[PDB]
Design a protein around this nucleic acid. Structure first.
Ligand SMILES: [Ca+2]
Length: 579
DNA sequence: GCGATCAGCG
DNA sequence: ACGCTGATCGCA
């Protein structure tokens, strides 16, 4: 029903200087995954190629890697990384429909060509789930069915580039796509393909030691409970805590008693068992998620883990990281932090280098709100999280522990992003009228932040959306909801999204500038990870001193704000040591 | 599959 | 009744 050439060889007219290109990888995780078919649409026609013939053809491989042969694609990072696993370099991607759709409206959740095409009333292509099926029924269809589906996706991309670019231009987002998100896509592909090497001998030794400690704490829990039970059974855990031991019920879930860590900490003065339960869950979390879960995804021949950075998922412009998530590796408790010792350079005599922005969202907020006092604080390089801890806990700077600073950090962000006196009281275990009075004092010191919070909510009501410094956008229809609780969630999104999203814009530009500078200096150093406002690299020992000057400067200069940007950095033998 | 929980980033 | 996430687990 759509005409195309089912090609048995590669011809010259398939290699035009502009084409829509589909390199189809059906498995969710595209690392080392099969490429099941290829479609090309250009001015000369529509073509389907079997991967075994296209990817062994020297003219087609050359065409893929020629940056002056421009390709329009959907999710070009998936294709670029699967091709790297095939030893083939993909260059010249000038349009990525997934990223164009994400910028126009992140809430659409566009996950396939069909969902993006729907945004422009284009429906001559089927959803990928309709073709491959769901779950245990998932399968690559017959070649005639596969070919038409890939050709239809390519024709869709071919037709949709111009109307997507037109709307991007109207939103002031076309340079955001072409100069930020698409260059970042190629850098992430490199980072994902490089992977991070893991010390599996160390990891497995930790897991065995961990398993002994688990049973020890597990027995003490049974003994404190006077009986054995399933510690992870909420119904049995509830019967022990709030029925047998008759502890007060501070919180319910839609399902029953709450047993979250905040509740259990509040119950610590009543019974020693609740702290054993906390230690027990923490150890179990390390065992299940960060020992066993990480060993499951280590590629055995290289001892590398290859995360996937989802670039078109979060509503603020942040990345996310999956299978494994390398953005939530433990750090705060020393027991969990030790897991970072298992993350090691990929070559001997290389080192890990980590650099992160200091108080990034407060500096962005100072700039966007133009609050005189907050701008002055960062022009003085004050540590606002420490200064808030001193105030909260009535201590001196010398006496601020890491824990108090982490707590004050949640107070600072909580307040600027709309925490109530109730939530602040519960978080600080202070009274409610003291919490409300502290919030009032905070906005007396930063009235420009308060004005900003009021203004941004008004602007969202008028426009229907909020934007970031580099013109990312988030629609907030609920901001005019008549339901108070729904409207209130939307208002906090209007306060938070421009700040968190601008911080995401800045680190992304920093990554692009860093990569260009590393190439200009002919360094072997390369990016491994981004963790929202932190960049993690590895490099030969011999490059560390140049990187100590290069990386902070590139990061601090990524944008020019009304206050300085500040970067902290460390390096060491393992990720653990790069702090 | 979903909700609670908890690991991270601000 | 601050925001943005992903993985594991029990299932009230
Ligand atoms: Ca930081």
């Amino acid at each position: 029903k759509m005409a195309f050439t089912l090609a048995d060889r590669v011809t010259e007219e398939m290699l035009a200087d502009k084409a829509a290109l589909v390199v189809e990888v059906v498995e969710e995780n595209y690392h080392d995954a099969p490429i099941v078919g290829i479609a090309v649409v250009n001015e000369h026609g529509r073509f389907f190629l079997r991967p075994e013939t296209a990817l062994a053809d020297p003219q087609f491989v050359a065409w893929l890697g020629d940056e002056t042969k421009k390709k329009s694609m959907f999710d070009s990072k998936r294709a670029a990384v699967a091709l790297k696993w095939k030893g083939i370099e993909l260059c010249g991607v000038s349009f990525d429909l997934l990223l164009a759709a994400y910028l126009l409206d992140p809430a659409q959740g566009v996950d396939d060509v069909a969902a993006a095409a729907k945004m422009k009333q284009y429906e001559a292509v089927r959803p990928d789930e309709a073709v491959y099926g769901k779950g245990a029924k998932r399968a690559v269809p017959d070649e005639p069915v596969l070919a038409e589906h890939l050709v239809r996706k390519a024709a869709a991309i071919w037709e949709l580039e111009r109307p997507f670019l037109d709307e991007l231009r109207r939103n002031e987002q076309d340079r955001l796509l072409v100069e930020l998100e698409q260059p970042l896509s190629s850098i992430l592909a490199e980072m994902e393909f490089a992977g991070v090497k893991v010390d599996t001998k160390r990891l497995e030794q930790m897991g065995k030691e961990l398993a002994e400690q688990l049973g020890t704490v597990e027995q003490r829990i049974y003994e404190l409970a006077g009986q054995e039970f399933n510690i992870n059974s909420p119904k049995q855990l509830g019967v022990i805590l709030f029925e047998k031991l008759q502890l007060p019920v501070l919180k319910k879930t839609k399902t029953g008693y709450s047993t979250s860590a905040d509740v259990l900490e509040k119950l610590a003065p009543y019974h020693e068992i609740v702290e054993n339960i906390l230690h027990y869950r923490q150890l179990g979390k390390l065992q299940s998620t960060y020992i066993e879960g990480l060993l499951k995804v280590v590629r055995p021949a290289t001892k590398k883990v290859h995360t996937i950075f989802n670039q078109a998922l979060t509503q603020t412009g942040r990345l996310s990281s999956t299978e494994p998530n390398l953005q939530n590796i433990p750090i705060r408790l020393e027991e969990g932090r030790k897991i970072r010792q298992a993350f090691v350079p990929s070559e001997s005599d290389w080192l890990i280098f980590a650099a992160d922005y200091s108080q990034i969202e407060l500096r962005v907020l100072a700039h966007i709100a133009e609050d005189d006092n907050l701008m002055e604080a960062f022009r003085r390089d004050l540590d606002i999280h420490t200064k808030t801890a001193m105030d909260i806990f009535q201590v001196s700077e010398d006496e601020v522990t890491p824990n108090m600073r982490r707590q004050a950090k949640a107070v600072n962000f909580g307040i600027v992003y709309g925490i109530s006196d109730y939530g602040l009281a519960q978080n600080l275990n202070i009274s409610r009228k003291e919490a409300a009075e502290f919030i009032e004092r905070y906005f007396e010191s930063f009235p420009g932040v308060k004005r900003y919070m009021e203004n941004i909510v008004q602007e969202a009501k008028q426009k229907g959306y909020v934007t970031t410094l580099l013109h990312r956008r988030r629609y907030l229809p609920d901001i005019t909801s008549r339901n108070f609780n729904v409207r209130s969630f939307a208002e906090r999104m209007a306060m938070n999204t421009p700040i968190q999203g601008s911080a995401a814009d800045i680190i992304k530009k920093a990554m692009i500038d860093l990569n260009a500078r590393l190439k200009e200096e002919r360094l072997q150093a390369h990016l491994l990870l981004q963790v929202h406002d932190e960049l993690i690299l590895e490099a030969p020992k011999e490059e560390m001193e140049r990187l100590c000057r290069l990386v902070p400067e590139v990061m601090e200069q990524a944008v020019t704000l009304r206050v300085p940007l500040k970067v902290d950095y460390h390096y060491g033998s393992t990720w653990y040591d790069a702090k």
